[PDB]
């Protein structure tokens, strides 16, 4: 395939596949090879021809994932009949997985470029939709049976390593690149963008902890080189995030984006106070309030690391678990806010009842404290003779006995649901990250000085990848075939390219000699 | 069907279906189309005739749900053989679901008016039973396989929107009404009764929080217009609830009814104290005690909102979860009351043992406090040399270590059981609400002033519904067929009626043109 069909043709392919799934899966419950042949025939084109059949069979995965999207819409609309459409959606996902795994054997470049990565357009209504591809489509709706395909994961691995890159000419194509052969655009790969963001997060943390522990004298400090590099890095981060915020408006509202914005916003306020102190009110007062508000950013700077270590399996599985647990705890937090607003209005009315509001601050404080179990009735002892005790102990009962134990229940159920699906949801997280990666002088000097051995290791590993790809292309293999040097295959791996062939010849000679050492040891 | 059979005939139809389910489902384990034909034949009537077959096939759903009722009674009586009758009850529910979904395709008005909504009478014993219909019957016994039918949910949607209304001539009929066409009786619909109760609950809350935060001076306040509107609304609510309490006696004992009665009772006491202060003992003392007891009603006024937002899915799912969790925690609360009564009798006997009861109040206080974890042994330090310590620490062990952790266990199990069945139990809750909705000058001025834009939005949405129903009746559709404008159907929705037909003609012209742009893109 080289030219894309029109959106109404892709709409017809989607309707033929939806009709096919409605006929083959009409019940809660299959995917025979005749059904797979029907799915291949549901697109259209002359069976006498080829590259006209492939032109419409290129949109097969995109159309099956839009069928999954439509069945999710159907389950949203017919809430009572959600199980039938969830069954149909799952059947579509399994058929899609079968198609991806079949075309992985048939032709790999056609699977990657045309089926999975090409951003097709579809006319769902009279409106024309944005160009999405099957990878982004399967990740947005969390098609875990599709994301856990061998071809899907291979495509994500090739994109991750930078082996497939977005075409600058057309942003819907994703041509391969030649890594067989110190290019700078190689550092634009998702592996190296991820690794450099990880190194820069650890470097940001190291510059942070060398600043907040910098205050030794009560006077204004020297404003060292590391403090300047630190505020330069943070003002770079806040201008990057505010350019993305102005450009991408109200879709930059991810939790991690707001978390980083809170981190950089706090450090910018600290920077401003420090700058005002350096060029002055009281200079030591501004320096003190600067280091205090900067020290408020230390949980954010140490919790930033989990975002930039999501590629590591331990941290990513942990954050998948935490995302599901907070998503379950939304119930507790709504009930806690409602009960807290109710009893807060009660106590503030008891405060206003005598005539003047005098202990409003201790009320807000102590009631907020009650969720931690640290609440004391000493504050309300001189308040109202039966009313404060009744309200406070009813509130403490509803929070500590009822709602916190409900929170433990929600967390237990959320963890039991997510620990079974931890690998699948982590694969969806890494897929989301991989597809996210395909959409002054002092700082540069510091970056060059600090990133040098990492660039060295990246370059030597890239040369090892290039020699591996050269070996895999010397044979008729798919550029990632010899990476592990496994025991069950006597002809695999890469020694460093004739030393590897000599090692394989040694392997087959020793194996064939020692098998034929006794003629009865056969079959 | 136009005339209802007698209760002994409906009893015979119920017995024939019970016999049929006993023959087809004799084991723990089916519902073949011959069984569905047998169920149609189990009612009776001449197969040569029609409207005499339909006269007795009208009670098929009511009779299958009484069969479900009888199998629930059987499982209550034969506790050992409860699994067989639960199987039979489930089989009856599935057969009933099949019948509802079949008659939804066959004839919709006959499904709604005659099968589901007509309140038939049955002679279970020599006594004659009340007129119940299949909707109310399936909700009282929680027939979730029947409530989650497409026809059941459609019938509930039509009742909810006011499209089917109870006949004033006969209260067992439920004739349709004509919405095709600013009627006041349109506001009597369950959608608008629900929405106006929601708006009035938020308005009650807004008037409440503008009163308890009204006290600024220690003297008696001005008795503003909002305070008078607030006490008028609350005395209207308490007279409404007491008329319902006198009329419906000891079946008005729902939790939410008692909760609202507690809210309105507290506000009435506050109203009485405020009224006595205004027309006087000490006036500022009565004003103070009025605002204190009114501020005691703030958790009730803020927790009232969950009742009037049950139609919203988030709040309704949350309250379904909370109902199941409290139903599980009944064990903990019984054991807690028993252990508390035991150790309370122990400490009060230790108080009486020296000769006089002097610290009884601190005993009741501290032991009640122990469940919150705030208990201190300082109160009992000067009490008895080994006895108070042994009793108090045994009590604190049984409450904090044993029983509160048991409460966490009960909550975990209750949430794990209800989160799987959250949609089904919420559908049963909304079904219960929908069937609940089919069983002075200053206040009117305030209501007219405050409900005006909501009445405006209701009227413009009603006109949109009327034009939609006019379009769906111009075709041979079922008055709710074009509501979503879906992508998989090229002929659906309502544009605002020739603009919609022009849009559909544009859709078919563009689709047929772009499909036939290449003749090979076919089939
Ligand atoms: C008062 C003093 C207290 C100070 C604070 C103390 C520190 C608190 C530590 C909090 C850490 C919690 C980690 C949980 C993260 C997670 O469990 O997930 C989040 C849910 O947690 C929540 O709500 C938590 C609500 C409270 C939701 O994550 P997300 O929706 O924002 O999606 C990302 C996006 O898509 C991309 O981020 P970026 O690349 O950077 O742009 C992806 O790279 C990334 O992989 C994610 O997918
Ligand atoms: C000391 C200071 C403390 C002050 C108080 C603090 C606030 C406490 C907040 C409590 C809110 C708890 C919400 C749970 C509601 C629920 O989870 O459910 C309840 C079980 O909770 C319970 O036992 C809780 C026992 C403690 C049972 O609900 P229900 O039996 O009463 O049935 C309704 C009927 O049928 C109709 O009410 P109305 O239309 O208004 O007439 C239907 O509309 C409605 O949908 C329901 O079905
Ligand atoms: Ca006060
Ligand atoms: Ca080997
Ligand atoms: Ca005593
Ligand atoms: Ca359409």
UniProtKB/Swiss-Prot annotation, chains A, B:
Bridged cysteine pairs (disulfide): none
InterPro entries xrefs: LHD_YVC1 (IPR056337), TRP_calcium_channel (IPR052971), YVC1_C (IPR056336)
Gene Ontology cellular component terms for the protein in this record: fungal-type vacuole; fungal-type vacuole membrane; plasma membrane; vacuole-mitochondrion membrane contact site
Amino-acid biosynthesis as UniProt keyword: no
Gene this chain is encoded by: YVC1
UniProt keyword annotation of Nucleus present: no
Vacuolar side: 215-252, 309-329, 380-389
Transmembrane intervals: 194-214, 253-273, 289-308, 330-350, 359-379, 390-410
Keywords: Calcium, Calcium channel, Calcium transport, Ion channel, Ion transport, Membrane, Phosphoprotein, Transmembrane, Transmembrane helix, Transport, Vacuole
Membrane topology category: Multi-pass membrane protein
Chief location of this protein within or outside the cell: membrane
Protein name: Calcium channel YVC1
Topological region Cytoplasmic: 1-193, 274-288, 351-358
GO MF, any single term: voltage-gated monoatomic ion channel activity
Family: Belongs to the transient receptor (TC 1.A.4) family.
Extra remark beyond the main annotation: Present with 1310 molecules/cell in log phase SD medium.
GO BP terms, alphabetized: calcium ion import across plasma membrane; calcium ion transmembrane import into cytosol; intracellular monoatomic cation homeostasis
Location of this chain's protein in the cell: Vacuole membrane
Known function: Required for release of calcium ions from the vacuole in response to hyperosmotic shock.
């Amino acid at each position: 395939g080289f030219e894309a069909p029109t959106p109404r043709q892709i709409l017809r392919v989607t309707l033929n596949l939806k009709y096919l799934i409605d006929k083959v899966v009409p019940i809660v419950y299959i995917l025979s090879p005749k059904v797979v042949k029907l799915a291949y025939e549901a697109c259209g084109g002359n069976p006498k021809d080829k590259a006209n059949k492939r032109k419409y069979q290129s949109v097969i995965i995109f159309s099956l994932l839009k069928v999954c999207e439509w069945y999710s819409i159907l389950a949203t609309m017919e809430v009572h009949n959600a199980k039938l459409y969830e069954t149909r959606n799952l059947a579509s996902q399994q058929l899609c997985k079968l198609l991806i795994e079949r075309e992985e054997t048939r032709d790999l470049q056609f699977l990657f470029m045309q089926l999975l990565l090409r951003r097709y357009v579809i006319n769902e209504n009279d409106e024309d939709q944005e160009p999405l591809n099957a990878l982004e489509l399967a990740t947005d709706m969390h098609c875990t049976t599709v994301i856990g395909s061998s071809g899907f994961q291979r495509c994500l691995k090739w994109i991750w390593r930078g082996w497939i890159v977005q075409n600058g000419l057309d942003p819907t194509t994703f041509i391969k690149d030649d890594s067989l052969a110190f290019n700078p655009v190689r550092l634009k790969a998702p592996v190296y963008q991820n690794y450099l963001q990880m190194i820069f997060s650890f470097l940001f943390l190291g510059l942070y902890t060398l600043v907040v522990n910098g205050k030794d004298s009560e006077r204004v400090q020297s404003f060292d080189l590391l403090e300047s590099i630190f505020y330069v890095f943070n003002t770079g981060f806040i201008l990057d995030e505010l350019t993305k915020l102005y450009y991408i408006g109200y879709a930059h509202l991810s939790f991690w984006n707001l978390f980083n914005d809170t981190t950089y916003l706090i450090i910018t306020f600290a920077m401003g106070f420090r700058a005002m102190s350096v060029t002055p009110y009281s200079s030591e007062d501004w320096d003190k309030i600067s280091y205090r508000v900067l020290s408020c950013a230390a949980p954010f700077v140490w919790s930033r690391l989990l975002l930039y270590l999501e590629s590591q399996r331990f941290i990513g599985i942990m954050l998948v678990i935490l995302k599901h647990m907070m998503k379950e705890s939304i119930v507790f937090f709504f009930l806690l806010f409602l009960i807290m607003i109710g009893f807060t209005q009660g106590f503030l009315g008891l405060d206003s009842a005598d005539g003047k509001r005098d202990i409003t601050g201790p009320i807000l404080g102590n009631l907020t404290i009650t969720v931690l179990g640290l609440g004391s009735f000493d504050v309300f002892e001189e308040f109202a003779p039966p009313y404060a005790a009744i309200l406070y102990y009813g509130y403490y009962f509803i929070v500590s006995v009822i709602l916190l134990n409900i929170l433990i229940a929600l967390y237990s159920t959320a963890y039991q649901k997510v620990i079974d699906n931890a690998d699948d949801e982590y694969m969806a997280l890494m897929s989301q990250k991989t597809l996210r990666y395909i959409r002054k002088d002092l700082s540069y000097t510091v970056m060059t000085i600090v990133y040098s051995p990492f660039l060295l290791l990246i370059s030597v590993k890239e040369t090892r990848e290039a020699r591996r790809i050269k070996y895999n292309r010397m044979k008729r293999l798919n550029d990632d075939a010899n990476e592990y040097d496994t025991p069950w295959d006597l002809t695999d791996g890469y020694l460093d390219d004739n030393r590897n062939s000599g090692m394989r010849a040694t392997q087959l000679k020793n194996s064939r000699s020692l098998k034929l050492q006794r003629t009865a040891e056969q079959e």
